[PDB]
């Protein structure tokens, strides 16, 4: 059984340190919210970035905190006019029996407004 975990975070400027710092806090928050203390049961982690972020790869931040053995891949998000700018999104594929409705998803900074749970 595989369960996806979603995260999203915004940054203020397209600079390498900000992109890396934002991604670190997002990943560690996604892990802590779901009680994952080890990287061994992540099948893969996929990142997307909006078009206005280009100075650093978000996967770089994942290697920094020691995910060297976790398969990573990054891509570009769709440039919908008026959409929230400067957003890094994460999809982590987690080997777990945890039910879909019990998995915790993490949205930070201005990305709070993207939460699918809000009515």
Structural domain spans, the chain: 2-114
| Entry resolution (Å) | 1.9
- Of 99, 114, 38, the closest CA to residue 70 belongs to 38
How far apart, in whole angstroms, are the C-alpha atoms of residue 70 and residue 72?
A: 6
39 DSSP assignment: S
Q: Pairing relation of β-strands 87-95 and 42-49? A: antiparallel
Structure token digits, residue 11: 């940054």
Method: X-ray
Q: How far apart are CA 105 and CA 100, in angstroms?
A: 11
Q: Can you tell me whether residue 33 is helix, strand or coil? A: helix
Q: Is 100 helix (H, G, I), strand (E, B) or coil?
A: helix
- Torsion sign, CA atoms 61, 56, 22, 114: negative
Determine the distance from the C-alpha atom of residue 30 to the mean position of all C-alpha atoms in its chain, rounded to a whole number.
Answer: 8
d(CA 7, CA 108): 8
The sheet with strand 106-108 has its strands ordered as: 72-76, 42-49, 87-95, 2-10, 106-108
Domain formed by 2-114, architecture: 2-Layer Sandwich (3.30)
Q: Are 113 and 84 in contact (CB under 8 A)?
A: yes
Question: For residues 31 and 37, what is the distance between their CA atoms, to the nearest angstrom?
Answer: 7
Place of tokens 């919210």: 33
């Amino acid at each position: 059984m595989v369960r996806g975990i979603r995260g999203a975070i915004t940054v203020n400027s397209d600079t390498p340190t900000s992109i890396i710092i934002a991604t670190i806090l997002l990943l560690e928050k996604m892990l802590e919210a779901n009680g994952i203390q080890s990287y061994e049961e992540l099948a893969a982690v996929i990142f997307t970035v909006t078009e206005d972020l280009t100075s650093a790869f978000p996967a770089e931040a994942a290697r920094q905190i020691g995910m060297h053995r976790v398969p990573l891949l990054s891509a570009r998000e769709v440039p919908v006019p008026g959409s929230l700018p400067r957003v890094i999104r994460v999809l982590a594929l987690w080997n777990t029996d945890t039910p879909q409705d019990r998995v915790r998803h993490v949205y930070l900074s201005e990305a709070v407004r993207l939460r699918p749970d809000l009515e």
